[PDB]
Amino acid sequence: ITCSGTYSNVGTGNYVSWFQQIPSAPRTLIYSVTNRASGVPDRFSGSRSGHTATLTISSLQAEDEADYFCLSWQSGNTALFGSGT
Amino acid sequence: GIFPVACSDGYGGLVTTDPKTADPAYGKVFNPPRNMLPGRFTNFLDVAEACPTFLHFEGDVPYVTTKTDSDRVLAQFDLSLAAKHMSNTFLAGLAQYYTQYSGTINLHFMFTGPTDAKARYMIAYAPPGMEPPKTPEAAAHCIHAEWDTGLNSKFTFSIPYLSAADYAYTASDAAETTNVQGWVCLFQITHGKADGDALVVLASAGKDFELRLPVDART
Amino acid sequence: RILTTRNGHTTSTTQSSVGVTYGYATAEDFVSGPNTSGLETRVVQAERFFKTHLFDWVTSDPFGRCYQLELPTDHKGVYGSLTDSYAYMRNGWDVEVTAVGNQFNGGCLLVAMVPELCSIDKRGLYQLTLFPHQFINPRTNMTAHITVPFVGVNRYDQYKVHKPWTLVVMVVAPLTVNTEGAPQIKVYANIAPTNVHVAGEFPSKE
Amino acid sequence: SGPSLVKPSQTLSLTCTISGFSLSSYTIGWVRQAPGKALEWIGDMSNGGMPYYNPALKSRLSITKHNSKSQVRLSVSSVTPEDTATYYCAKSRYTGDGSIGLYGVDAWG
Amino acid sequence: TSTGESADPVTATVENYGGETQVQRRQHTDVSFILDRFVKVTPKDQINVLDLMQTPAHTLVGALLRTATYYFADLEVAVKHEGNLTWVPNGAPETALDNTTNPTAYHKAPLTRLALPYTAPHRVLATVYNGRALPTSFNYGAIKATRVTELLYRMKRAETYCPRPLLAIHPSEARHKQKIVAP
Amino acid sequence: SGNTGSIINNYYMQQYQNSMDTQLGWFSKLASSAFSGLFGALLA
């Protein structure tokens, strides 16, 4: 998956990893640049690119409901920005 | 004593292109005198630029027909010495066997039309950065020349070689899609009441046109 | 030790500074190579400073964080889109990174001008200090000055094909120190292109 | 993990605070999340008594910083009907407060 | 000695407290010398292009190039090949080695040495070039005779510009212990 | 220069041997510029 995202918002030195298993706590300590917090380490592991691209996981079958959230620190407007999905 | 010496396998290998004389068996042979010869050439394409050669346009015709239309764009061919529109000039025929040209390419223009009808030709350069122009007003900003054929027609022009490096290739590789040394143009910003007045173009080598690194190619 | 600066028409002097830290030369190398048919024309009106906001280290920062801004980047106003109307353009660079130390921050940030860097494997970031560099600690000097002449093929470069320089602001100091100081000190880099040249102009679309 | 209230103008209260582990040596955070909208970190708490809220909602926003009962009480006045979203007791490892809300940061995750 | 965070070179030189320094003969590693050692290169049969940075990461003059962003060179190839090999200029043409008549050599010994002069179209080659994979410019022609067995490069009278990070094998533990040779 | 002997003029002329330099019209100059001494004095 990927979000629509300017280079300066997260591209110039930012980290995007924000993980949810909504159906209902969106607060699952869970991340994507790294695979810590123990839960969902295999088949849900992602990573980030040189510009907006967002976590990837293993294909051809789906073992999770709804879809996941992406969060990125944004430099322009000091308030954190997160949306898309 | 026998004076010793160690043969080296490396640095003694036989190769074409080394300067070690043939030392042929025949000796004391006198050739016929050959001085006062009627026309020598020290070297080609560096000093063989005295004779300018024709170019190729659409239709196997070294002359471009002055056209009358809202379209005013003339032949817009690449500069690489292996581009189509020069595929038969002596410049190209000599650049093909060598791989890189470091000097300005010199064009020529003459008017075969009658005295009654004149025109205003302008030829424009375009560096490789972006799309080659399509209209004089749009190609006006880039370096270009202007002329008109009133009292003597043959007008030289010196397409200058501006650098991405100190040399540039003469065999355009199939890798890219925009030729490296950029396009050229020919433009009829205005013509009088002349028509079907041929314009023939001539190519030749200028002052700093020094090829190097001889190679082969099937040609 | 106040440091003066000037380029074109705008200038901002640093209240405290360490002093310029040159690199790879003292002045530009020979300018009009016999290859480019001498069509070069110097342009004066095109060198003025231009602010550009960069990443600001916060406490959460690990040593490894690195950041590289493609130079030169999109410009607006005088010297903005000049490259477009020219090709094979060349320029030296006078970068300037400014940060607010607070006279109370332990963390040290080091910035190095690097040529043609490729994304690192995070193992050479140690030896990164080879290239011209001046590296700041808010205790003593909150700003650094760096001037490099261009280096790559000598005659000219097409800035639309390959950028030859980069900024690298990797934070040398581990994390950051919140010793009664501002929690986040955003760093600002006043890039300043010096001594440009240009060559054969594109067919405009105006 | 509740949507609280929208019509009331009183400051939203979300004391989802349980002593699983203390607030004594750790950070606790507060996030706004609607059914669907942009996500904002309302606030957070780190050891050192230095908690900073978001810049856009600076004056109207305030989070209680009491260590007794490991509690956290949102202090947000002038609440508009558009503050209709679910909040969550959000926990971070230490010194992640910075000044405004940060996550996605390495070794902080 | 008052380092000002200038990052300018400053050296104590072990003078302030004890004696004087024994004379430093910083010699036998000056760039023009350590780039003469020959390097093995993984060879490709029936065709290959000679590029200097094509050496295995772990080799002396195979890794002391990436210490230099730019490098002027004169390449002395030496091949152990089974048929007539051919050589080409930097301003490369495709399918010109088939007709030969380009500088070539014959096998009169186990090792054949070719002194290709500098043929690149620029002032200096590049080892990395922002834009991975270098553009088709930085190349020393090509070599293609029969099947190639072992390939050998040698930079001669070289000169390097702008020095870049080097590595050392990352010690798994303190004082990485490499087995030294002993009688 | 480079790592080689050949004190006698290499039998091949230089132009044939190796390239030649274009002509128009730093890390060693760094060492000699090294800071020395102490901020103040060296007592005793």
Residue numbers in the entry:
A (entry chain L): 22 to 44, 46 to 107
B (entry chain 3): 1 to 219
C (entry chain 2): 13 to 218
D (entry chain H): 7 to 115
E (entry chain 1): 2 to 132, 157 to 208
F (entry chain 4): 15 to 39, 67 to 85
From the paper:
In the current study, we isolated a NAb (R50) that neutralizes FMDV serotypes O and A. We determined the cryo-EM structures of FMDV serotype O (O/Tibet/99) in complex with B77 and F145 scFv, as well as R50 scFv in complex with FMDV serotype O (O/Tibet/99) and with serotype A (A/WH/CHA/09).
The structures show that B77 contains an intermediate length HCDR3 loop with 18 amino acids, but F145 and R50 contain ultralong HCDR3 loops (50 and 61 amino acids, respectively). The complex structures show that B77 and F145 make similar contacts with the BC-loop and HI-loop of FMDV-OTi VP2. Residues in the VP2 BC-loop (OTi-VP2T71 and OTi-VP2S72) and in the VP2 HI-loop (OTi-VP2N190 and OTi-VP2Q196) interact with residues B77-VHM56, B77-VHT101, B77-VHS105, B77-VHL108 and B77-VHW114 in the B77 heavy chain. In addition, OTi-VP2H65 and OTi-VP2D68 in βB and the BC-loop interact with residues B77-VHW93 and B77-VHS95 in the light chain of B77. Structure comparisons of FMDV-integrin and FMDV-NAbs show obvious clashes between NAbs (B77 and F145) and the integrin receptor, suggesting that FMDV neutralization by B77 and F145 is facilitated by blocking virus-receptor interaction via steric hindrance.
